[PDB]
């Protein structure tokens, strides 16, 4: 039913692309830099640190997920 | 006052830096480095050099006068006869 319905309401969407100039995604570079916006009037310090990670379609990510779970999140309310 | 945690109170400032491994250790050391050194030297040349030149002049004259004194006196022997 869904497929038959989508035909009537989404068949008109254009599909022919100009000169087949599909916007292929260019790669992106990662740089080890730091930005420090200092404002001493704010309540708490607030930092974030990161490193280059695999793409969305690599097996390794699964293992990284496990490693993340080992580190674990935390909060002050947790009654542990 | 002696711990990085509490030294001063600053606000509304941002900073940007790059990793040591992402940049050259000698960037523009041929087109932008030398001229800056020349600026440094020129900007403080007349404030130092000339005084030490006076020292050199005082040093040379001194030595010259010292040796000039040890020369024999022809006016102390003209009449000695
Ligand atoms: C191939 C040919 C290569 C030729 C390379 C020539 C340029 C060498 C260079 O890059 O020097 C830095 C220099 C840039 O210096 P800078 O970082 O902008 O200013 C601060 C200085 O570096 C000076 O400040 P600094 O903090 O960088 O270093 C100061 C350091 C001394 O820093 C030194 O540079 C010592 C000499 C090491 C030379 C290594 C050259 C490597 C290339 O002195 C100390 O900190 C210790 C003092 C201890 C005193 C003990 C006294 C005992 C008595 O390069 C230049 O652009 C000027 C070079 C001038 C050459 C003139 C040639 C005319 C023809």
From Swiss-Prot, chain A:
It is found in: Mitochondrion inner membrane. The modification N6-acetyllysine is found at residue 8. Expressed in brain, including substantia nigra, striatum, cortex and cerebellum, and in spinal cord, heart, kidney, liver and muscle. Belongs to the peptidase M16 family. UQCRC1/QCR1 subfamily. Component of the ubiquinol-cytochrome c oxidoreductase, a multisubunit transmembrane complex that is part of the mitochondrial electron transport chain which drives oxidative phosphorylation. It is linked to Parkinsonism with polyneuropathy: An autosomal dominant disorder characterized by late-onset, levodopa-responsive parkinsonism with asymmetric tremor, rigidity and bradykinesia. Patients also manifest a sensorimotor polyneuropathy with variable degrees of distal legs and hands muscle atrophy and weakness, and absent deep tendon reflexes. Component of the ubiquinol-cytochrome c oxidoreductase (cytochrome b-c1 complex, complex III, CIII), a multisubunit enzyme composed of 11 subunits. The complex is composed of 3 respiratory subunits cytochrome b, cytochrome c1 and Rieske protein UQCRFS1, 2 core protein subunits UQCRC1/QCR1 and UQCRC2/QCR2, and 6 low-molecular weight protein subunits UQCRH/QCR6, UQCRB/QCR7, UQCRQ/QCR8, UQCR10/QCR9, UQCR11/QCR10 and subunit 9, the cleavage product of Rieske protein UQCRFS1. This is Cytochrome b-c1 complex subunit 1, mitochondrial. It comes from Homo sapiens (Human). The gene is UQCRC1.
Curated annotation (Swiss-Prot), chain B:
Keywords: Acetylation, Disease variant, Electron transport, Membrane, Mitochondrion, Mitochondrion inner membrane, Phosphoprotein, Primary mitochondrial disease, Respiratory chain, Transmembrane, Transmembrane helix, Transport. Pfam families: UcrQ (PF02939). The modification N6-succinyllysine is found at residue 32. The keyword Electron transport applies. InterPro entries: Cyt_bc1_su8 (IPR004205), Cyt_bc1_su8_sf (IPR036642). The gene is UQCRQ. Component of the ubiquinol-cytochrome c oxidoreductase (cytochrome b-c1 complex, complex III, CIII), a multisubunit enzyme composed of 11 subunits. The complex is composed of 3 respiratory subunits cytochrome b, cytochrome c1 and Rieske protein UQCRFS1, 2 core protein subunits UQCRC1/QCR1 and UQCRC2/QCR2, and 6 low-molecular weight protein subunits UQCRH/QCR6, UQCRB/QCR7, UQCRQ/QCR8, UQCR10/QCR9, UQCR11/QCR10 and subunit 9, the cleavage product of Rieske protein UQCRFS1. Component of the ubiquinol-cytochrome c oxidoreductase, a multisubunit transmembrane complex that is part of the mitochondrial electron transport chain which drives oxidative phosphorylation. It is found in: Mitochondrion inner membrane. PANTHER family: CYTOCHROME B-C1 COMPLEX SUBUNIT 8, UBIQUINOL-CYTOCHROME C REDUCTASE COMPLEX UBIQUINONE-BINDING PROTEIN QP-C. GO terms for cellular component: mitochondrial inner membrane; mitochondrion; respiratory chain complex III. It comes from Homo sapiens (Human). One of its GO terms (biological process) is pyramidal neuron development. The chain crosses the membrane at residues 39-67. It comes from the Eukaryota. This is Cytochrome b-c1 complex subunit 8. Residues 1-38 are mitochondrial matrix. It is linked to Mitochondrial complex III deficiency, nuclear type 4: A disorder of the mitochondrial respiratory chain resulting in a highly variable phenotype depending on which tissues are affected. Clinical features include mitochondrial encephalopathy, psychomotor retardation, ataxia, severe failure to thrive, liver dysfunction, renal tubulopathy, muscle weakness and exercise intolerance. Residues 68-81 are mitochondrial intermembrane. The modification Phosphoserine is found at residue 15. Belongs to the UQCRQ/QCR8 family. It is a single-pass membrane protein. The modification N6-acetyllysine is found at residue 32.
């Amino acid at each position: 039913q869904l497929l038959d319905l989508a035909q009537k309401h989404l068949g008109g969407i254009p599909w022919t692309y100009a000169e087949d100039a599909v916007p292929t995604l260019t790669p992106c570079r990662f740089t080890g830099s730091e930005i420090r916006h200092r404002d001493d009037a704010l309540p708490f310090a607030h930092v974030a640190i990161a490193v280059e990670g695999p793409g969305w379609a690599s097996p390794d990510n699964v293992a990284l997920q496990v490693a993340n779970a080992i580190i674990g999140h935390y909060d002050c309310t947790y009654g542990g | 006052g002696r711990e990085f945690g509490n030294l001063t109170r600053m606000r509304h400032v941002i900073s940007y830096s790059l990793s040591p491994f992402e940049q050259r250790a000698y960037p523009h050391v041929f087109t932008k480095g030398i001229p800056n050194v020349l600026r440094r030297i020129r900007e403080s040349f007349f404030r130092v050099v000339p005084q030490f030149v006076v020292f050199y002049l005082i040093y040379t004259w001194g030595t010259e006068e010292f040796e000039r004194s040890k020369r024999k006196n022809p006016a102390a022997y003209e009449n000695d006869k």
